[PDB]
Amino acid sequence: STCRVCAKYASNKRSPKLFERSNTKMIDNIEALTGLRLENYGCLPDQICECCSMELASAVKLRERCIAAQRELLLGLTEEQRQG
């Protein structure tokens, strides 16, 4: 019934389970975004809501696009322009 990521209502049905040894992707993406390793505790929620899943997928895509774009722009340059 509660989302571990935004602490609001979920569904306990259409809310994916964060810790299900296969969406370790989600926990990885959360740590990459926030610098927090979320741990499975009995007294905390174990679910992510659909809205949080979607925004997380979007933020990861932008992060990867941004890193790859800095390498692509670097290659577009002449060897001289390459500095710092």
- The reply, when asked if residue 3 is annotated as ligand binding, is yes
Q: Secondary structure of the chain in the HEC alphabet? A: CECCCCCCECCCCCCCECCCCCCHHHHHHHHHHHCCCCCCCCCCCCECCHHHHHHHHHHHHHHHHHHHHHHHHHHHCCCCCCCC
Which of Zn ion, a copy of itself, none sits in contact with 49, Cβ below 5 to 8 A by type? Answer: Zn ion
Using CB under 5 A, list all residues that contact Zn ion: 3, 5-6, 49, 52
Could you tell me how many residues of this chain bind a copy of itself (CB under 8 A)? 37
Binding of a copy of itself at residue 7 (CB under 8 A)?
yes
CB-wise, 28 or 61, nearer to Zn ion?
Answer: 61
Question: Should residue 49 be labelled a site residue for a copy of itself when binding is judged by CB under 8 A?
Answer: no
Q: Which amino acid is at 58?
A: S
Contact flag: residue 50 with a copy of itself (CB under 8 A): no
